[PDB]
Every structure is written in C-alpha cells, then in structure tokens.
C-alpha cells in the first residue's frame, strides 16, 4: 500500500500523521497494481 526512498511497503490506514515507520522517511509511493494492463503497441 506504500513505500518510500529505497525500501519496502507499508500497511493501510492512518490517524496520526504519515511517515514511513520503516525508513523514518516522509514520502509514500503507491506501487502499480499487479493486475492486467493492455498497452496497445503502436
């Protein structure tokens, strides 16, 4: 559900603030969904 600057994801929700509780970093990244994605190769 997340990530930051050079490591691993995090769980969902929130209540107080938002920093990565694994890096101490402040930025979160929503990874691309692993589902199906058809890109019409022109």
């Amino acid at each position: 559900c997340a990530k930051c600057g050079k490591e691993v994801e995090l769980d969902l929700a929130t209540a107080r603030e938002v920093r990565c509780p694994y890096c101490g970093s402040k930025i979160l990244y929503k990874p691309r969904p692993r589902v199906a994605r058809r890109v019409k190769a022109i």
């Binding site: 600057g5 603030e17 920093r19 402040k26 930025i27």
Partner: protein, 145 residues
C-alpha cells in the same frame, strides 16, 4: 609562433569546467552568507524597550543546516528533492546571539532562532555543496544540475 584556434578553445573550455557555468548567483550568495547578512544585523545594533533599563545587543548570526519541523514541531534534516516533492521551503534556521543589557551591564550571550532563510541550491550552506555525482544521484538529482 601562433596559437591556433584549437588550443585557445582548450583555454576557454578549461575556464568553463573549472569555474561555474551559472555560478553567478552562487558567488553572490556565498558572499551574502559570510560578508553580508552580518552587516544588516551589526548595523541595527540594539533594539528597545520604552523602559530605559533593559537593552538587547545583537551579536553575530550563524546559518544552521537545512531542516524542517513537520507536524507538531519535529526537527528533521531536509534535502532539495524532499522540498520539491512536499511543497516545502528549502531553508535553514538563522541563529542570532543576543545580549540582555540591563541597567548598563550585560547579562550573558544567548543563542536564539530568528526565523528561516531560503538556501540557494549548490551554495555554501546548501546541503549539496561538496558532493560527488554518485551522492547527488543517491539524493535523487542529476549531476548535470
């Protein structure tokens, strides 16, 4: 006898690599940090109060490291990429030493923040100063900046 175009070019090119390509704002800022800044604060001298006993002498200012206090005040070091990504201000605190002069006599110098001053990129106070390409890359910037 004769220097030819190519060699002259080598001269210029050397000037370019060695000196700064756009460091015009840079030398000026580097001078603003050391020489200047201190001038405005040494010229205004003291301050108030309307009651003549107290006085406060302004000493010399020091420029801290680029940091920011996020939610509910929490001092964390900041890099330019973090500032651009978070809509923050790439700046550092300015700490001034001030001397409480009561009845004529001085109390003791006290170090206190003044606010926050925006740092120019790749300047002296700028966290990117003496960093190699790999460290800039690790930061999230291109060495071409």
């Amino acid at each position: 006898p004769t220097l030819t175009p190519d060699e002259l070019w080598l001269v210029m090119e050397s000037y370019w690599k060695e000196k700064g390509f756009v460091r015009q704002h840079l030398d000026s800022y580097n001078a603003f940090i050391d020489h200047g800044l201190q001038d405005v604060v040494n010229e205004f001298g003291e301050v108030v109060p309307d009651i003549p006993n107290f006085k406060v002498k302004f000493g010399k200012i020091r420029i801290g490291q680029p940091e920011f206090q996020e939610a509910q005040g929490q001092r964390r070091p900041l890099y330019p990429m973090d500032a651009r990504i978070r809509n923050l201000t790439y700046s550092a605190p300015l700490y001034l030493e001030m001397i409480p002069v009561v009845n004529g006599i001085e109390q003791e110098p006290v170090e206190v923040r003044i606010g926050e001053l925006p740092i120019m990129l790749k300047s002296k106070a700028c966290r990117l100063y003496g960093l190699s390409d790999e460290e800039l890359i690790k930061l999230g910037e291109d060495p071409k900046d």
